[PDB]
Write an enzyme that holds these catalytic residues in place. Structure first.
Site, PDB file in Angstrom:
ATOM      1  N   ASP A 143       0.928  -1.343   0.056  1.00 30.42           N
ATOM      2  CA  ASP A 143      -0.085  -0.072  -0.169  1.00 30.42           C
ATOM      3  C   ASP A 143       0.671   1.142  -0.028  1.00 30.42           C
ATOM      4  O   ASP A 143       0.560   2.286   0.618  1.00 30.42           O
ATOM      5  CB  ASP A 143      -1.069  -0.130   0.942  1.00 30.42           C
ATOM      6  CG  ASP A 143      -2.093   1.073   1.017  1.00 30.42           C
ATOM      7  OD1 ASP A 143      -2.289   1.476   0.012  1.00 30.42           O
ATOM      8  OD2 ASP A 143      -2.652   1.280   2.009  1.00 30.42           O
ATOM      9  N   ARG A 147      -0.047   9.246   0.383  1.00 35.49           N
ATOM     10  CA  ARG A 147      -0.789   8.947   1.863  1.00 35.49           C
ATOM     11  C   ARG A 147      -0.019   8.398   2.827  1.00 35.49           C
ATOM     12  O   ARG A 147      -0.203   8.853   4.005  1.00 35.49           O
ATOM     13  CB  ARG A 147      -2.284   8.657   1.681  1.00 35.49           C
ATOM     14  CG  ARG A 147      -2.198   7.189   0.941  1.00 35.49           C
ATOM     15  CD  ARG A 147      -3.621   6.511   0.752  1.00 35.49           C
ATOM     16  NE  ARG A 147      -3.375   5.240   0.141  1.00 35.49           N
ATOM     17  CZ  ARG A 147      -3.688   5.046  -0.966  1.00 35.49           C
ATOM     18  NH1 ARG A 147      -3.945   5.990  -1.910  1.00 35.49           N
ATOM     19  NH2 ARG A 147      -3.471   3.703  -1.572  1.00 35.49           N
ATOM     20  N   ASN A 148       0.738   7.337   2.421  1.00 40.15           N
ATOM     21  CA  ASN A 148       1.560   6.401   3.433  1.00 40.15           C
ATOM     22  C   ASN A 148       2.871   6.896   3.743  1.00 40.15           C
ATOM     23  O   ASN A 148       3.632   5.941   4.193  1.00 40.15           O
ATOM     24  CB  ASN A 148       1.052   5.261   3.146  1.00 40.15           C
ATOM     25  CG  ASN A 148      -0.495   4.826   3.134  1.00 40.15           C
ATOM     26  OD1 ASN A 148      -1.321   5.377   3.898  1.00 40.15           O
ATOM     27  ND2 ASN A 148      -0.960   3.726   2.691  1.00 40.15           N
ATOM     28  N   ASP A 161       1.969   2.680   7.607  1.00 43.26           N
ATOM     29  CA  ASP A 161       0.917   2.170   7.293  1.00 43.26           C
ATOM     30  C   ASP A 161       1.098   0.656   6.635  1.00 43.26           C
ATOM     31  O   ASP A 161       1.053   0.289   5.666  1.00 43.26           O
ATOM     32  CB  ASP A 161       0.053   2.990   6.045  1.00 43.26           C
ATOM     33  CG  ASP A 161      -1.469   2.303   6.405  1.00 43.26           C
ATOM     34  OD1 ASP A 161      -1.976   1.175   5.944  1.00 43.26           O
ATOM     35  OD2 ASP A 161      -2.314   3.453   6.847  1.00 43.26           O
TER      36      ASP A 161
HETATM   37  C1  LIG Z   1      -4.877   5.023  10.203  1.00 41.74           C
HETATM   38  O1  LIG Z   1      -3.954   4.387  10.870  1.00 41.74           O
HETATM   39  C2  LIG Z   1      -2.524   5.096  10.466  1.00 41.74           C
HETATM   40  C3  LIG Z   1      -1.632   4.252  10.826  1.00 41.74           C
HETATM   41  C4  LIG Z   1      -0.160   5.026  10.539  1.00 41.74           C
HETATM   42  N1  LIG Z   1      -0.102   6.274  11.144  1.00 41.74           N
HETATM   43  C5  LIG Z   1       1.113   6.709  11.631  1.00 41.74           C
HETATM   44  N2  LIG Z   1       2.177   5.924  11.518  1.00 41.74           N
HETATM   45  C6  LIG Z   1       3.138   6.121  12.372  1.00 41.74           C
HETATM   46  C7  LIG Z   1       3.403   7.225  13.032  1.00 41.74           C
HETATM   47  C8  LIG Z   1       2.358   8.185  12.963  1.00 41.74           C
HETATM   48  N3  LIG Z   1       2.266   9.609  13.251  1.00 41.74           N
HETATM   49  C9  LIG Z   1       1.354  10.666  12.913  1.00 41.74           C
HETATM   50  C10 LIG Z   1       0.311  10.726  12.209  1.00 41.74           C
HETATM   51  C11 LIG Z   1       0.018  11.992  12.335  1.00 41.74           C
HETATM   52  N4  LIG Z   1      -0.927  12.912  11.788  1.00 41.74           N
HETATM   53  C12 LIG Z   1      -2.098  12.283  10.811  1.00 41.74           C
HETATM   54  C13 LIG Z   1      -1.364  11.870   9.576  1.00 41.74           C
HETATM   55  C14 LIG Z   1      -2.802  11.512   8.754  1.00 41.74           C
HETATM   56  C15 LIG Z   1      -3.839  10.550   9.431  1.00 41.74           C
HETATM   57  C16 LIG Z   1      -4.094  10.869  10.859  1.00 41.74           C
HETATM   58  C17 LIG Z   1      -2.856  11.369  11.784  1.00 41.74           C
HETATM   59  O2  LIG Z   1      -3.191   9.105   9.638  1.00 41.74           O
HETATM   60  C18 LIG Z   1      -3.634   8.416   8.545  1.00 41.74           C
HETATM   61  C19 LIG Z   1      -5.093   9.055   8.126  1.00 41.74           C
HETATM   62  O3  LIG Z   1      -4.810  10.214   8.778  1.00 41.74           O
HETATM   63  C20 LIG Z   1      -0.720  14.074  12.272  1.00 41.74           C
HETATM   64  C21 LIG Z   1      -1.304  15.241  11.650  1.00 41.74           C
HETATM   65  C22 LIG Z   1       0.617  13.742  12.838  1.00 41.74           C
HETATM   66  N5  LIG Z   1       0.866  12.660  13.193  1.00 41.74           N
HETATM   67  N6  LIG Z   1       1.820  11.897  13.392  1.00 41.74           N
HETATM   68  N7  LIG Z   1       1.018   7.964  12.157  1.00 41.74           N
HETATM   69  C23 LIG Z   1      -1.218   7.263  10.926  1.00 41.74           C
HETATM   70  C24 LIG Z   1      -2.675   6.357  11.258  1.00 41.74           C
HETATM   71  F1  LIG Z   1      -2.393   6.364  12.615  1.00 41.74           F
END
Ligand SMILES: CO[C@@H]1CCN(c2nccc(Nc3cc4n(C5CCC6(CC5)OCCO6)c(C)cn4n3)n2)C[C@@H]1F
Ligand SMILES: [Cl-]
Ligand SMILES: [Cl-]
Ligand SMILES: [Cl-]
Ligand SMILES: [Cl-]
Length: 300
Positions: A143, A147-148, A161
């Site tokens: 994937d 986005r990831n 992801d």
């Molecule tokens: C939906 O499960 C995913 C799993 C992977 N993920 C993740 N992995 C390792 C570290 C990390 N750290 C993080 C994520 C964010 N975000 C967003 C990004 C976009 C978002 C909401 C959270 O995640 C994807 C959809 O929408 C922001 C503003 C700051 N950080 N720091 N995140 C994000 C999700 F949890």
């Protein structure tokens, strides 16, 4: 020993070691919060993303979040996101590193008028480095998409992801290689295809691949020989690499290690490889009881 033993440590955290500060987003998976983790006995504050389960705790949901956590606990690379631990409350929580600038897809869309060639080509190197590590670890991501990829700083991105990742449904057709769409075959070289689409998303400033085309037609479009169009900023040099990622013969697509090499050559002379109007001038970000804040990457 037919495969090697996975000697990764899964760390279990008390709920009292951390605090949620704001919601960062919510879906059907549950809720990502911004928090701080303060491990007991250490004068250390670690900014975290806490992904809580959907509250509807359920054997199917709890299975799949722990598969993600398995993989995220098992990786260790500068360009891959790691799990810091799990909390086994009533709704299980994964505690991850905060990547404060968000996803790279949203970042390119928001910051387009200030993203220059050096940044784009460096992001390409970093994603290729992290995917090459997953190949070394024998993981097919399944994937990969912009986005990831998350942004720790504008200068530092990491792949995340791991909820499709497999060793050795609803599916992201427009990033998938043809063998994956037609036959469910997934390989490291089908992640190379998705890398091509990911690079294409970056060089188009976050444009949607195949916009308007129904996903049923994608396989026929690809079999007929069509691919995504040359992004305006891209020299034939960069675009020919995208094209090579989208070959029908998977072994004629480049390796991740070769993408590192090629993109890092290009990153030594950016303006020869991407043509962006104003490039020469563009300057991006480089960054509260917060004396003892340490980033997770320095907390080994
Ligand atoms: C939906 O499960 C995913 C799993 C992977 N993920 C993740 N992995 C390792 C570290 C990390 N750290 C993080 C994520 C964010 N975000 C967003 C990004 C976009 C978002 C909401 C959270 O995640 C994807 C959809 O929408 C922001 C503003 C700051 N950080 N720091 N995140 C994000 C999700 F949890
Ligand atoms: Cl593994
Ligand atoms: Cl376009
Ligand atoms: Cl051009
Ligand atoms: Cl090549």
């Amino acid at each position: 020993m037919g495969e090697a033993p996975n000697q990764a440590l899964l760390r279990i955290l008390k709920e009292t070691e951390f605090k949620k500060i704001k919601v960062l987003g919510s879906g059907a998976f549950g809720t990502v919060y911004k928090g701080l983790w303060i491990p007991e006995g250490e004068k250390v504050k670690i900014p975290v993303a806490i992904k809580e389960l959907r509250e509807a705790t359920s054997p199917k949901a709890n299975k799949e979040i722990l598969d993600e956590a398995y993989v995220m606990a098992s990786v260790d690379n500068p360009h891959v996101c790691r799990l810091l631990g799990i909390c086994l409350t009533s709704t299980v929580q994964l505690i991850m590193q905060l990547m404060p600038f968000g996803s790279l897809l949203d970042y390119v869309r928001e910051h387009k008028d200030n993203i220059g060639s050096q940044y784009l080509l460096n992001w390409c190197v970093q994603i290729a480095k992290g995917m090459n590590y997953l190949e070394d670890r024998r993981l097919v991501h399944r994937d990969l998409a912009a986005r990831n990829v998350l942004v720790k700083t504008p200068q530092h991105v990491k792949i995340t992801d791991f909820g499709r990742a497999k060793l050795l449904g609803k599916v992201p057709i427009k990033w998938m290689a043809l063998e994956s769409i037609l036959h469910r075959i997934y390989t490291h070289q089908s992640d190379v295809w998705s890398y091509g689409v990911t690079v294409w998303e970056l060089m188009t400033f976050g444009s949607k691949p195949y916009d308007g085309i129904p996903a049923s037609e994608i396989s026929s479009i690809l079999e007929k020989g069509e691919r995504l169009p040359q992004p305006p900023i891209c020299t034939i040099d960069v675009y020919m690499i995208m094209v090579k990622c989208w070959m029908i013969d998977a072994d004629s697509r480049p390796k991740f290690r070769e993408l590192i090499i090629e993109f890092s050559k290009m990153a030594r002379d950016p303006q020869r490889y991407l043509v962006i109007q104003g490039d020469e001038r563009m300057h991006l970000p480089s960054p509260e009881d917060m004396d003892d804040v340490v980033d997770a990457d320095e907390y080994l």
